[PDB]
Fold:
Amino acid sequence: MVKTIDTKTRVVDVTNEIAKKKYQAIRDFLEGEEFKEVVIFGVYLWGNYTAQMLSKYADKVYLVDINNSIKFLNLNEFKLKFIRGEVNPDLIVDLTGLGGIEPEFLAKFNPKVFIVEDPKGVFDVDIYEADNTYKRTAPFIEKAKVGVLKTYRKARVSKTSGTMTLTIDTIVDASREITSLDGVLYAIPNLRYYEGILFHENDIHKFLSEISQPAITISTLNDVLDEAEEILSNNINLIYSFVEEL
Amino acid sequence: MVKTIDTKTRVVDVTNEIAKKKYQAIRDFLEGEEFKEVVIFGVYLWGNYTAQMLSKYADKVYLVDIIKFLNLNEFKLKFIRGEVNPDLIVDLTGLGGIEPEFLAKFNPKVFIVEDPKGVFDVDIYEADNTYKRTAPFIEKAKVGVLKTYRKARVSKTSGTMTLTIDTIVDASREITSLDGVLYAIPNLRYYEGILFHENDIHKFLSEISQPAITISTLNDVLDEAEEILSNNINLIYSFVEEL
Structure:
C-alpha cells in the first residue's frame, strides 16, 4: 500500500548539471579562443569537468589541487614547475574559493585571461569577510581579460556558490517540495560529505556508490516519480551562472 | 580555514528521543494497569523500544511484524491454535496496517492505536482507518489513540521515521543560516530498506549511527547546531487521547 520510490536522478546527475552551468558561463566568457597552457586551481572532484572541457581549447591543461593530456598536480609540484620555469599559462582559472590560492602567488603570473570563482552566495558577514576575490583579481586588471564567475539560486538562499553547496541545497529543497505533494509521507535527501569519503577515508568504492545514490527516496501512497523529477528539475533550473568582466 | 564538523547527536539518538516521547505518552495512558499479555503490531525497528519497555509492565510480549518476536502469520497460527489471548493490544502499524476485521477477533482490556495522520493530506486522510479499528473495542475496553505532531511545523504523518527526517532536515536548514556556515548535510537514508529489503545489518547499524548533520563552516558552531537540533526535537509533542 505504502510505496517506496527512488528518483531516477542521482546526486551525480545534479552535480554534473551544475558543473555544466558553470562551465557554460566560462566558455561564453572565453568566447571561443585558444590558449596553449591553462592552469586551473581547485579540487579534482569539482574541477575536472572544466579541465576536460578546456583541453579542447588548449594544448596543455594543468588541474592543481591543495585522464588523457590533462596533467593533475598538488600545488607543490606546480610551484616547483613554475619556479624552474616550465610553466607559464595564458589562461588561469581559480576555482578554490574560501581560503584558496593566495594573491601574492597569483601576482607572479602573467596570463592573457584570468577567471576567478566568487564563492559568496547570499549575504553572510563571515563569508563576506573571509572572501578575497577582488584582491585576487587586483594584479591582473589592466593587463588581462579578467572575469569573475558567479553562481546563484534565483530567489533562494545558498551560503556559497560551491557545486557541493548548490547540490545540497538543491536536493534538500526539492525533498521538501516533494513532501508537500498529495499522498507523500516523506522524502529523504540522499547526501554525503563525499570529499570526506574520497580523501580522508580513501574509499573510492564507497565514494562512487554514494554519489550514484538516487537524489531522493520517497515514501508515498501515490506514484509521484515524474512529478518529483519535475520538481527537482525546476530547482536545478533555479541555478544561474555567469562571468562578469572586470 | 574551512572546517568540517559532525554533530555529536546521531540519527539513532533522534529516533530514540522521539520513540521515548511516544512511549512515555503510552505509559501515561496505560498507568498502573499492568498486563498479563501484550500484543504490539508494527515493524521491529520502530516497535522494539515500546516492546522492550512494556515487557516490564507485562509477562510475555509479542511484537508482530508484517519479548519474543513474530511475523503476522505465525501469530495468526498461534491465535487459531489458542495459544495467545492478550489483555493489552497496541497497534503501531499505521497506513495499510493491521485490519479491523482481524482485530475484532480479539478481546483486550485496553486497546491503543496509533494515528498515522499528521498535517492534513486528503489522500492520507482518506487512507486512514484508525477509528474503524477502534470501533470494535469501543465500549468494551479502555481505548486510546496515540497522536504525535510537530508544533506549528509540517509533517505528513506521525511515524517516527517521518518525524526523524523532518526533524533533521530542517535542523540542518536552520544550521545553514548561522554566521559563517557554508552548508549543512542531513545524513539520512531509508533504513528499513537497508535492513529488511537488502538485509545488510552491519550497514544498517553504520548508517543509523551516523552523525545527524555534517557542517561545512568558518566557525566552530557545534554547540549552536546541537541546540538547534534539540529545539527541533522539542517541537515534537506526543499524547494518547482516550475515546
Q: What stands out?
A: The CA atoms of residues 189 and 216 of chain A lie 5 Å apart. Chain A touches chain B through 40 residues (CB under 8 Å). The first helix of chain A runs from residue 11 to 30.
